[model samples]
Target chain A: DGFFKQLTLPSGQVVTVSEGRGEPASTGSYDVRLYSGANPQFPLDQFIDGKVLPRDGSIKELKLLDLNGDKQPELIVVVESAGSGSYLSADAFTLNPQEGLDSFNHVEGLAPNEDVIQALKT
Target chain B: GFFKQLTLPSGQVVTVSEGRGEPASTGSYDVRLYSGANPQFPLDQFIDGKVLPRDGSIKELKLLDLNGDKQPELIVVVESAGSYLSADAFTLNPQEGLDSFNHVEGLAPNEDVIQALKTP
Candidate 1:
């Protein structure tokens, strides 16, 4: 079966997703942070900030999906950041219930192809 | 016009995006961290973690984007932590260039949700 659920971050961020259930069921979560202060840092502040804002840096549209057939969903994170250097990045990751709360594995970074690059150039 | 760019987090995490430029140009960036220890945290360690890995109690996944369009992009973060009290949260902000590294404002959080829930 399949269903949808909404979660909030510590900083009061909201995330809604279409979740599935049963043998091939997959579950996951996300967080955000914002640094200000000379050094610009905090304990759980970063996690809190990431939740409210979009990760792509730019105000672009994003969608969450269950990529693997196992039922585990993957996050389609997009954001634009221009600090010392400015660029856009998209990343994907999966969650393992067998491991518990502290378990997370890295997947792969999503890059726009040359066609998309040329489109951006024009 | 619109263009695409890829960014790497402090933890060496890589991301790519199709950006728009000129009159309607937009830009942004992101950072990640892992915590492990008593109070379970550190300073720029969080920043460095994005390039590496964090230790301690941790959160989950996240995405970033500028809800409003003024040339600056926003961030969308997610995660899960369990303890005396645990929950998920989110934030939104814009990038002000390289010389400056800071977040401008805060948005409302999407409260009342579980971190372990998944799809099948």
Candidate 2:
């Protein structure tokens, strides 16, 4: 119910990630963190506020999606929340060196709901 | 091993049982509170009949005073009629069974996760 990826930096450092270091739900309600290591480690030229949230929890799918072509990586997590109740939550995280988990844009379960509706329209 | 043994600051005993990690409405037996042993409503009181199918497993759970009443409310993710794929949330009030339930699609995703996870 989750996803993971490992990034090998140029300096022999490998960074491992799990859903932009997400959580059970929203990024604001809780401290958001994603997995990153320098292959034990290297310097990825950044520091995230907290370590990571929902580390090895219920992850379904995860990906490092680049929205703008600016090349800055964004972590997206799709997680299973309820059992038969059939609820899921998603969150996106961008690393902030000076500050912690700075902010989140899509809290899912809403826009994504409409997005899902729109996706099936065609 | 699928038990959340939490002692709230107010000393109430709250527990979510099934397993440590996985996903489903069956993921949760129930989100109940134990105010005492059995005399003062002792046993774990089910939050609006919360269980595997109704509340499903969980996306997230939090203990906070959503209304700023100084007493914490249990915020849980929900799926109507035990149906999985939908996105919804429920707030459990100690005095009130179900304080509120919020959802995006209401009940669009008819299928549950056991099948989704099994989708191969």
Candidate 3:
């Protein structure tokens, strides 16, 4: 009952499958599901429109960095809540074909102040 | 009957007559009155001991050329009234020959606030 499922690659390794669902769809609010092949109950992270999720949710701006010193690229999600007193929170996640949903990690909250968040690009 | 009154050599003429009452002793409070060669009924100026003279009053410190011009001098006078719910006034008077006085212009309603006034 989620968006993405797990699939085994030709090399015999289990990997995660991800899909997005929302109205204005480019990237604001979405539902991200994790497939570990364990058949765990409710493997999806449901995000309501206009609300933020703990995982990679939205990216208003992008910067390239060699964070983990790995050659592989990582996806960084930077999102801002629309409500008053809202702040920016970022999460870093990468797609791993071998160990599926084990690559998700949350980053620290960015731009603590609302005024400072408004001054940011996204 | 004022503190110091005498004829000057310049002959430009300066005179300070007695003000309010007769001149008192050196330690007593006295008033001064100034008059030109041609004296009028009202006289030119009157100064009292309890009130600051025109020339000598408290001054304030301010940044010069607040807008663009060179720094200008700022003058301030702190004053107060004795009774509560009373109006007090004080001003900077250059013409009067008094230094400081309790009864003056631009005084604040708070007596404690006025007593603490000093050139800063």
Candidate 4:
């Protein structure tokens, strides 16, 4: 019913991205959460605030990559606008073994997609 | 009708437009691609007449290079009434052309879909 994705970071830590269900299903709103742990199943510890990610629209996609080639993975969350336009926006967080997640300012090179680059720089 | 302009990684701009046929309630929408220089002519198109799963609507259009080729691919995500998702995508070809890339079910913005799209 909701989205869930898990991947291993460069430091061998597990990172999970998930969406909280919306009421009535057609609302097109969901709380996207991030977790850093071993288990991908529900009820795992949440590392980032659910409010940090946008909930105005349902999540269209999620990705994990090293945008700056820093050897650490950045979690990219893409959410579609609730309106008919369906324009997309994304948020990126770098997962560090010591620093956990810090807001990513920008990518050193071009992003994997336009929305992501837009999200990162502006 | 919906319109979007994107600048690919290659520094070329392209326009993505959507149009529905007559009797829009029962008609499907077609996604068209055109060069930013010559928007009058379409370089390629994805006709969705009876080909897509029913009760779905376009959710997002993205330009990403899933294969690490430095060239962005065209991706369209469609979600069903029940929130089920799928994608129709195309890769850039030689001479600024477009080639059908991949079709993925249960589409998400996650790495699994990225890896799936990367496969030949």
Top lDDT prediction, candidate number:
4
Q: By TM-score, how accurate is candidate 1?
A: 0.24
Cα lDDT tens digits for candidate 4, B47-117: 11112221255667888887777778877666654535667777654364656678877654353555676
**lDDT tens digits, residue span B19-118, model 3:** 1121121111122222223333222232222211222212222212222233221223222212222111222223433232223344344543333332
Between candidates 2 and 4, name the one with more favorable TM-score. Answer: 4
Choose 1 or 2, whichever is better by TM-score: 2
Model 1 stretches with alpha carbons more than 4 Å out: A1-61, A81-87, A96-122, B1-46, B49-120
User: DockQ for the candidate 3 complex?
Assistant: 0.00
Cα error, residue A91 of model 1, in Å, equals: 2.2
Docking quality (DockQ) for each candidate: 0.03, 0.02, 0.00, 0.01
Q: What are the per-residue Cα lDDT tens digits for candidate 2 across B1-120?
A: 244544456555555543222234332233444443343443333222233322444554556554446766554444443534433334544455443444333434654422222233
Which TM-score does chain B of candidate 2 obtain? 0.45
Over A11-44, each residue of candidate 1 has an lDDT whose tens digit, in order, gives: 3333333211110121121232222111122222
Root-mean-square deviation (CA) per prediction: 20.7, 18.8, 33.4, 20.1
- The most accurate candidate by TM-score is 4
What lDDT score is found at residue B59 in candidate 3?
Answer: 28
Worst 10 residues of 4 chain B by lDDT: B45-54
lDDT tens digits, residues A50-111, model 2? 32333222555565554434465455555554445435555565553323233343443433
Weakest 10 consecutive residues of candidate 1 chain B by summed lDDT? B16-25
Task: State every prediction's TM-score relative to the real structure.
Answer: 0.24, 0.33, 0.24, 0.37
The count of backbone overlaps in candidate 1 is: 95
TM-score of model 3's chain A, to 2 decimals?
0.39
Residues A1-122, candidate 3: write the lDDT tens digits.
22333433233332332212211122222222222323223221111111113322234433323345555444444555443534566554443444433334454345545432233223
